[PDB]
C-alpha cells in the first residue's frame, strides 16, 4: 500500500470457455492400432473391428 499504489488499474482476465468437444470428439480411441476397440464374437474371439 502507498500513495502511488492508489493509481493501479485492473483489467478483466480473458474469457476462457472449457468443455467437451463437439460430438465428444477425441474421448474414444479411433484409428489407433495401439488402443484398438473390440467387437468380437464370443467364443471364437475374432475381432470384427
Amino acid at each position: 500500500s502507498s500513495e502511488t499504489n492508489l493509481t493501479q488499474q485492473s483489467m478483466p482476465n480473458r474469457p476462457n470457455y472449457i468443455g467437451f468437444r463437439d460430438n465428444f470428439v477425441g474421448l474414444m480411441y479411433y484409428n489407433s492400432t495401439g488402443n484398438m476397440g473390440v467387437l468380437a464374437g464370443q467364443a471364437s474371439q475374432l475381432n470384427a473391428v
Partner: protein, 50 residues
C-alpha cells in the same frame, strides 16, 4: 493338406470368469474347437501379464 477357407492359425481366449484371492488366482475359459478342426493341446498355454 491345407484348407482353401478363411480360418485363423492362433486363437486367443479371455476368461469367462476370474476369481482372485490372497494366495491363488483362478481363470476359466470356454475352449472352442469349431467344426472341421483338430486341436493338439500341446499348442496351448496360459499367457499371463502381471
Amino acid at each position: 493338406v491345407t484348407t482353401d477357407r478363411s480360418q485363423r492359425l492362433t486363437l486367443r481366449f479371455v476368461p469367462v470368469d476370474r476369481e482372485d484371492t490372497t494366495y491363488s488366482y483362478k481363470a476359466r475359459f470356454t475352449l472352442a474347437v469349431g467344426d472341421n478342426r483338430v486341436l493338439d493341446m500341446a499348442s496351448t498355454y496360459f499367457d499371463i501379464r502381471g
